[PDB]
Each structure stands twice: as C-alpha cells, then as structure tokens.
Amino acid sequence: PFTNEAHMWPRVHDQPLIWQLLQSSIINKLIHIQSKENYPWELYTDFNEIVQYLSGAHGNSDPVCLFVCNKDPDVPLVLLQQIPLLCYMAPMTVKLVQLPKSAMDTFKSVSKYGMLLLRCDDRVDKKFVSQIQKNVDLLQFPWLNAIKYRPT
Amino acid sequence: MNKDQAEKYQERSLRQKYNLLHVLPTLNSRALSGLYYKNFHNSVKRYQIMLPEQLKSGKFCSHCGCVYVPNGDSDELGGESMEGPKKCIQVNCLNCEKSKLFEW
Amino acid sequence: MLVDLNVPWPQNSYADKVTSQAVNNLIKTLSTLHMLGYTHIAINFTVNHSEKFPNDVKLLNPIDIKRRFGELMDRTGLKLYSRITLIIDDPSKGQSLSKISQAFDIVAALPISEKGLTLSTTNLDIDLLTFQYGSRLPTFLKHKSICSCVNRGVKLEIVYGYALRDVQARRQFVSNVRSVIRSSRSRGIVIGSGAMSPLECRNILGVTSLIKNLGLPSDRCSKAMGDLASLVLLNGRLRNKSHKQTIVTGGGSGNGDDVVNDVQGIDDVQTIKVVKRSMDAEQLGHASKRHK
RNA sequence: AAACCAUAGUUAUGACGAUUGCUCUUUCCCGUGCUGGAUCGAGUAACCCAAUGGAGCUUACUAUUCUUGGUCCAUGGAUU
RNA sequence: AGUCUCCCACCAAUUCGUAUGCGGAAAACGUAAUGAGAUUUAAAAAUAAUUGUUUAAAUCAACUCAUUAAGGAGGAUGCCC
Ligand SMILES: [Mg+2]
Ligand SMILES: [Zn+2]
C-alpha cells in the first residue's frame, strides 16, 4: 500500500481518558511564558522547523514524538499529504501519533495549527512513551511492499 | 480469455507496473519516471476504471514525473525542500528546478 | 531443400481401418523418397466436409508419427507433417475447423463449386487451395480473385503425380494446370506429387522437365519448390503452434532448432520446451567476447 | 440520314534470325587508374495490358526473378 | 490498372463578378516559411477513392490541420565590400 493502511494508524480505546490529561499537560506547558514553555520540554510548533529538524540538522536524541490532528474534514489535506513519509525517512525514530477524536480541535485553537513534535527524552515523556510503544507502532515504506496500491 | 483469469491478470499487470514505477530509475531518472508514468496511465485508461482522488492529488510530479518524497531500503528523496507557507504552501524537488504550490 | 506436401494416406473416412500392407507400402515409398534425395515430406489425409466429424481430439489424427514414423525416422533422417484436405461442395452447417486446424498442422481445401470456392478463398482459414485435376474445373477461373488470395495468403497446388494414374486423365490434368498457371500469374504455385506407391515417384529433374513442358519456367519452379514450399510450411506451422504470429514457443539458437525443423524436441501434447538454463545475467553481452 | 473521326485504334499489335549497348563474375595488357580493349558465360526483368482525348492524386513493380543516385543522433571492423 | 476529381457552348452576372501564400482555366491539384497536435485529440485506433503490410507515437523522415494579398518608397541589422 501507499496510503491505504495510512488510514488505519491507531488501534486502542484506552486512549481518551489519558489523552485529555495530556492536553492538561499541554496547558501546563503553554501557560508559563514564551520561553518557559520550551524551558523544560523541547516543543516545536512551526511547519518550517518541523521539517528542518527532521531534515537531518541535529541527531542528538533518537526518540522523537510527533503529533498531528487529522482523519477529519476541515483540515489541510495538502499538508497531510506528505508528513508520514517525512517522519519515516528521517533517521530519528519518530513515532507519529494522530489525535483519535475530531472534537479535540482545541489543539488547533491553542498552539498554532494542530502540529507538534517533541524530543522525547524527559522522564515523564519516556515515562509514558514506554507505555505508548506498548500501544501502537505502524510505519512502513511504500517502495517495499507496493502490492496493494488500490485494486478493486 | 476467461473473465475470472482476465481480472486477475489485470490486477497483476497493475501491480507490476506500479512496482516498476518505484525502485531505482523512476526515482532517479526523470525520463524513465515520465515514461513509466505515461505507460501506467495509458494502461489504466484502457480499462476505464476511476482512480482514487486521495492519492491522485499528491501522487507525482507534473514537470518530470517523480514521486513527491521528502527526507529497510535506503533510497533517494524526491522533494528537497518543503517550506512553510511564507505566503502559501509550496513543494520543490531535485530532479528538475520547478515547484508546485497549493493554497490552504 | 526439396519439399513434397501431397503424400496421400490410404484412408478417406474414419470408418476405415488401415491394414499393415498400406503402412508398409508407405514406409517403402518414404524410404524410396529418402534414397534418391528429399528434405521435407508432409503426408495428406483427405476427408469430406459434409459428414459428421467425431467429437474427439486424441482420435482425430490417425497418423501416429511418434510410434512408427518416430521409429523409422532415426534410420531415415527426415521429418513428417500431417495435412488434411477439406473437400467442400455446398455450404452445409457442419463446420468445426477450430479443432481440426489445431490438431493438424496444414489444412487445405478441394472445392468443387463456385460458392464453396469463394467462401474458402475469403473466409475459410486454410493454407493451400487444391483443385480436382481428375474432374473438370467448376467454372472459368478469374485473375483478380486468385491474385488477391495469393497476396492474402493461400496459394494454388499443382499435383503432377496424378497424371501417372490413367490415360484419359492426362488431358484434363493439362487443361486444368495450364488454366491455373494462366489465372494465377505464376506467383503462388506449389507443386506436389500425389503418389500412393514408390512406383510413380520421380527425380527433381523429371519434375522440372514436366513443369517446363507444361508452361512454367524452370527457375521459377526451383524457386517455388525451395522457398515457397518452406514458407507455406512455416505458415501452417506457426498459425497452429504459435499464436497469430506474435509469440513463438520455439527458440532457434543456431541453425538447426527451428519451429519447422526441430520436431522431436518441441513437445506436442503441450507447447512447452524444457531446456536447461543457458541464459543468465552475469555473462558478457558481446557474443564474440563471451567465452565459456 | 448522316455527323466516321487517331503520326496504335475496338480488345489486332503475330513467327523467328542477326547486331550494338548495360549488371556482376573468369583472365590478359600498357602507366595505379581511365563510360579502355578482347574473349568464357548468365541476365535484359517484375507490375500488368489500351477501347474517345488531356491534366492532377493515390495504389502495384524491380531477392542467383535487368538497374541507377543520395541519405541515415542504424549497427559491425580499423586509424587518429 | 483503380467504385477518385475536373475541362471538353456562352453569359459587366439570381451565371460560386473568388484582387485571399505561390503556379494553374478548373481540380475531393503541386509546393514553400512558422507553431502545435495523438481514440486524455480539430480529426486516423485497442466498446469520396485506394492500399497484403496501410501516418507518427528516442531523434530524424511521413500525414493532417491552423496563419502568411500583388507591386513601388524610407529606416535598422547581418555578409563581400
Ligand atoms: Mg481498361
Ligand atoms: Zn521536475
């Protein structure tokens, strides 16, 4: 497949109760001041630096965790075109995660656009990324399989 | 030709064409990229089956015909740059020097 | 290279059972043809179109090239082909050529009427058009039809072996052959010998003398017996063995394994050719540089 | 009741003999060479034929079943 | 040879009174310069004539269509000078 299984990324329903708690953490981040948001935690919220950090500028930390609001209308199809191939080709282990409910567009309302990648090495970040690697992991390359482009 | 064996042959031919449209030269050689793109489209036109718009939008290039790809098999990247909006979102490639922009 | 395409089989209908004396006489005449000199021989099997054709495949070909002719060919050194002549007079509904053409190699016709002649020249997929040199001609043969049929394919066949049968038959044979040569513009002419015994066979020079006395030049006779015979054999071999001249299951590496030449190698119950691996990707492309 | 008229005219253009010329191959000679000369041979083809006259276009022809001129980001060999 | 086209009486004009790239009485006629095109096209195919194959679809070559009215004078550019 090329984008066929790119529809079905996440498969767990234990997600929401801890997800809006993750948005509570997002509030904790964003309520300090322009600098003290990224003071303890590396958060990036600009598509330019989003792609520049994955281009190969710095390779310090392997685990990167990127989060996008998608699988819903009222969203840039043109920009959701190319982000999974970008996070896969990146040499860093980038765990792309897609918000599971469309009503969580408060994310769109708060940071910039509904895009946010972080450098997951802080002890709470990996404290839960070790519980999310248990949860979901699905990322392949279309050049390898290319057996289910879109038949039938 | 039996219809049941003809359908299977059709899917097999489509699979083989899309697979050959991938690995080394369709990525590197823009000539072969355009050639195999034209061949695949002339093959899907003869069957008269609609193509999925979700991929049809961002499928390939319009100047040479390479897969729009940014950076188990390490390969070449299709798109060298992908800026922010800066006024409006655009995407550029290496194989040629033209860029395609879409509006939000 | 000499080709004889009109060796008759001692049988007309499927109700007949051929005795051992007839196949022994055929063995003797094949040995006779090999003694003086010949390259290709294709035996003929005449049958009528009106009667019902048996609804079988493995019983339609009563030749058995592999059992007896395959037993004698290793001592003889030539190849045999199966040919059938469809004698058609009226357009009846019995028509299942899709099986006889695929079971046999070369399919010819022997029309008696004008409508049958026209339909066999236009629509019927055949290889040779033979006329009854024993009987009279149906009507006045035209030029444009024969020329367009030669340009389209099927050529005419002259059977000089029939003139050795009777005394009154030679006059009608000559009267038919001269008209055929005049109406065919001497382009699509293939000569054959319809002899049932080795007693009525001749040398290539005797055939040349007879045909040049009939009216056709000698160089054209040699050309038609050398290249026009090989081409009419190739047509009937490729239209059956291969597809409609697009993909051939025979691969000629040198100059002996050809679709018409190689007959013991190519399987017939199927169309595969099991050959050991001789072409990989690591060998040098230039044959002059490629050495084993 | 005719207007009847073709440097072929109504489906006729027949039978052979002789001479010159052209293609390749066989050899000789002067001065490498010459639209050179002389023998030993073969070939002079194929497409097809008028029916009142002229022009244009298209379609059949030339493989030991006559020939000629040029071109080729076609391949094959050699030198720089 | 061919189921192709046209001339073989005129008409200061209901009679193609057509100064339309050139030649031509006409021609479903020859050729010249430029741009583009391929059942996704103006139109050729895998839902008037002719030709066995019957334009092209790396580049060249070939087909189709779309533009360029005749003569004299002035200025600019390029070549021998
Ligand atoms: Mg005539
Ligand atoms: Zn390009």
Closest-approach nucleotide to residue C143, Cα vs C1': D48
Q: Which residues contact A148 (CB under 8 A, 6 or more apart)?
A: A1, A4, A5
DSSP string, C268-286: SSS----------SSS-S-
DSSP C147: H
The answer to whether B15 and A147 are in contact (CB under 8 A) is yes
B101 touches chain A (CB under 8 A): no
CATH of the domain spanning C3-241: 3.20.20.140
Dihedral, CA of residue C111, residue C113, residue C119 and residue C125, to nearest 10: 0
C75 CB burial (10 A radius; 0-12, 13-18, 19+): exposed
Q: Which residues contact C223 (CB under 8 A, 6 or more apart)?
A: none
Chain B residue with minimal CA distance to A51?
Answer: B82
Structure solved using which method?
Answer: cryo-EM
Strand partners of residue B46? none
Closest-approach nucleotide to residue C144, Cα vs C1': E1
Give phi and psi for C45, each to the nearest 5: -130, 105
Instruction: Give distance CA C228 / C1' E8 (Å).
Output: 51
B56 touches chain A (CB under 8 A): no
Q: Helices C204-214 and C169-183: crossing angle, nearest 10°?
A: 70
The answer to whether C94 and C56 are in contact (CB under 8 A) is no
> Which tokens sit at C289?
């540089």
* AA identity, residue C216: L
> Which tokens sit at B41?
């489209």
> Which of C112, C120, C162 minimizes the C-alpha distance to C139?
C112
Element (H, E) at B92: strand B90-92
Give the SS3 label for residue C83: strand
> Which tokens sit at C18?
């051929």
Q: Residue holding tokens 């026009």?
A: C228
Contact A146 B104 (CB under 8 A): no
Give phi and psi for C59, each to the nearest 5: -125, 5
Residue C163: Cβ within 10 Å count: 19
Q: What gap in Å lies between CA B79 and CA B91, rounded to an integer?
A: 7
Strand partners of residue A94? A64
**Beta-strand runs (E) in chain C:** 3-8, 40-48, 79-87, 106-109, 128-130, 155-159, 189-192
Q: Which residues of A touch B (CB under 8 A)?
A: 2-3, 46-48, 51, 54-56, 76-79, 81-82, 85-86, 89-90, 141-144, 146-147, 149-151
As a whole number of Å, the CA-based R_g of chain A is: 16
Contact A143 B51 (CB under 8 A): no
Q: How far is CA C211 from CA B55, C44, C205, C224, in A?
A: 73, 22, 10, 12
Contact B72 A89 (CB under 8 A): no
Calculate the CA A46 to chain-centre distance.
13
DSSP A93: E
> Which of C195, C197, B101 minimizes the C-alpha distance to C207?
C195
B56 touches strand E (CB under 7 A): no
> Which tokens sit at C280?
């990989």
Q: What gap in Å lies between CA C279 and CA C291, rounded to an integer?
A: 13
Q: What gap in Å lies between CA A24 and CA A47, rounded to an integer?
A: 23
* AA identity, residue C36: L
The answer to whether C5 and C190 are in contact (CB under 8 A) is yes
Q: What gap in Å lies between CA C160 and CA C129, rounded to an integer?
A: 15
* AA identity, residue C29: T
> Which of C224, C30, C267 minimizes the C-alpha distance to C128?
C224
Q: What gap in Å lies between CA C42 and CA C168, rounded to an integer?
A: 28
Handedness of CA A60, A63, A69, A75 (dihedral sign): positive
Question: Which of B11, B18, B82 faces A146 most closely, judged by CB atoms?
Answer: B18
Contact C/B (≥3 CB pairs under 8 Å): no
Contact A90 B79 (CB under 8 A): no
The answer to whether C56 and C99 are in contact (CB under 8 A) is no
Q: Domain ranges in chain C?
A: 3-241
